[PDB]
């Protein structure tokens, strides 16, 4: 997945440590991951990638002036047609639709 | 002598273990219909299969 | 911290370095801890089990004029019944160890006789010599019990051994009379004992006593002989305490741990008023009964 499952070498003990990872290091790296997830969920991190882009070079939708959260920073430059697509889709993810496959609908999505 | 119960039941019991045979079914189920667990009444795997079905 | 300073006590004429270094410590993270012990003249030798390093004429004078140590120990134990002495567990225990000295050879030869299915013909001088040399070096400490038993059960006996056996034995485990006669012959040819009938008696009685146990002839190879972790001597296999198997029974006072000295207790280390709260001594009797 484009997500990184381990944000850190959680499994690091002496070889033959008969477990994936000690509970200590697991807690250390769950703290790193709680920081990363709160950073993302609180700066309202939004990424995106659309067909027929170089899918590795991600799109920063949260870095768009129509969905910007900061005020003194400039998010990113994006073509107008693609912008009207994306930000309309971000608005579209603001609700889940009865009569379709449902979705996890969060406050921090809007 | 045969731990996991490969020799229980007796060959006749198989042929009499069908669907129209609650009589020979119910001689391996608990007073409520429960199977006696494999640690407890170690049955032959074929017996267990024929019996569940 | 109101930090405490302790100036190190330096050695003196009066207060020697050894005492000033063990009776005293200048680092007060050990103060008021507890009372340690150590052994000196004869306590050290008693505990450490250091045999006297022999010599020629002089050690042999001290060693020849020994006489029957087991008896003289008994003499010294009973003499505690005279008027000027008390019968002491320390005397009894010196007797007990002077009698149980040959524990090793006895537990071994009993294992050999009674735990070795089909031990060749032990009465045949071949296996008898294996037996003699092994038990001889089981006493005299040159071999361990475990390694010597492996040397016994591994020594060379007869070619086509299983094939000769399956002709003489149904289940393989032969008659033990040749074995025990061989072992008693062993300990009576080798002067393992000063008083001969003792060898046979222990060899016989330990076997008789074990004959009562469940699985009375299997031994878990670990605990069976010496190793790192062992069993308490009441639970050893062919040992002398296994019949001394019992336990204690306690009704404590309302105040029983306090009075830990009040009774008619033998004191090796007598109390003095600095630790002794109100204790009077082991001889005083506040509640006397009239009697001629």
């Amino acid at each position: 997945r484009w997500a990184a499952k381990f944000y850190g070498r959680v499994t690091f003990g002496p070889r033959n440590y008969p477990y994936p990872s000690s509970r200590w290091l697991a807690r250390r790296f769950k703290m790193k991951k709680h920081r990363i997830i709160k950073r993302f969920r609180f700066r309202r991190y939004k990424l995106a990638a659309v067909a027929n882009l170089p899918f590795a070079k991600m799109i920063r939708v949260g870095l768009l002036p129509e969905l910007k959260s900061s005020k003194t920073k400039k998010g990113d430059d994006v073509e107008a047609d693609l912008s009207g697509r994306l930000v309309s889709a971000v608005r579209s993810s603001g609700g889940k639709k009865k009569g379709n496959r449902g979705r996890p609908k969060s406050k921090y999505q809007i | 002598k045969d731990p996991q119960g490969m020799q229980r039941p007796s060959p006749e019991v198989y042929m009499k273990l069908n669907y129209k045979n609650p009589a020979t079914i119910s001689r391996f189920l608990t007073r409520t219909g429960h199977m006696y667990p494999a640690d407890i009444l170690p049955l032959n795997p074929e017996a267990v299969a024929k019996l569940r079905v | 911290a109101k930090r405490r300073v302790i100036v190190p006590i330096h050695p003196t004429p009066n207060y020697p370095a050894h005492f000033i270094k063990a009776s005293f410590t200048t680092d007060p993270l050990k103060e008021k801890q507890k009372a340690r012990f150590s052994s000196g003249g004869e306590a050290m030798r008693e505990v450490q089990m250091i045999p006297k390093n022999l010599e020629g004429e002089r050690s042999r004078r001290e060693l020849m004029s020994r006489g029957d140590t087991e008896f003289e120990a008994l003499v010294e134990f009973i003499q505690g019944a005279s008027y000027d002495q008390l019968i002491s567990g320390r005397r009894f225990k010196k007797v007990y160890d002077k009698l149980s000295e040959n524990d090793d050879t006895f537990v071994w030869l009993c294992h050999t006789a009674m735990s070795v299915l089909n031990p060749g013909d032990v009465r045949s001088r071949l296996v008898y010599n294996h037996l003699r040399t092994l038990a001889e070096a089981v006493a005299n400490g040159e071999m361990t019990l475990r390694t010597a038993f492996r040397f016994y059960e591994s020594a060379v006996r007869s070619p086509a051994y299983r094939e000769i056996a399956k002709r003489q034995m149904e289940g393989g485990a032969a008659t033990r009379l040749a074995g025990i006669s061989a072992a008693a012959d062993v300990m009576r040819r080798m002067g393992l004992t000063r008083r001969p009938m003792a060898s046979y008696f222990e060899l016989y009685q330990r076997i008789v006593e074990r004959s009562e146990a469940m699985t009375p002839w299997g031994f878990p190879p670990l605990f069976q002989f010496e190793e790192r972790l062992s069993l308490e001597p009441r639970l050893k296999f062919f040992s002398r305490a296994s019949q001394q198997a019992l336990e204690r029974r306690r009704r404590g006072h309302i105040m029983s741990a306090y009075t830990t000295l009040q009774g008619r207790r033998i004191f090796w280390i007598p109390p003095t008023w600095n630790r002794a709260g109100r204790f009077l001594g082991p001889h005083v009797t506040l509640y006397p009964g009239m009697t001629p």
């Binding site: 002496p14 033959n16 008969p18 250390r28 | - | -």
Partner: protein, 73 residues
Amino acid sequence: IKTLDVREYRPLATPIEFRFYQRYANHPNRQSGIQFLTHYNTHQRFRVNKDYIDYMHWGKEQGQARLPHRHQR
């Protein structure tokens, strides 16, 4: 992560398995070990896709549930 030890930790019993990892295996499904003396197409008895060993019941006749049965040795 905080990149430096917060603990005066000093546990002293180092398992022989943690040191000599070239010899013992503490992963599950690697306890079968190195069996070169099987017949299988591997020496790594845990990579043989063939006969997964029942661990609780076998061994009455062959030592341990690892080793091959006395009719396949």
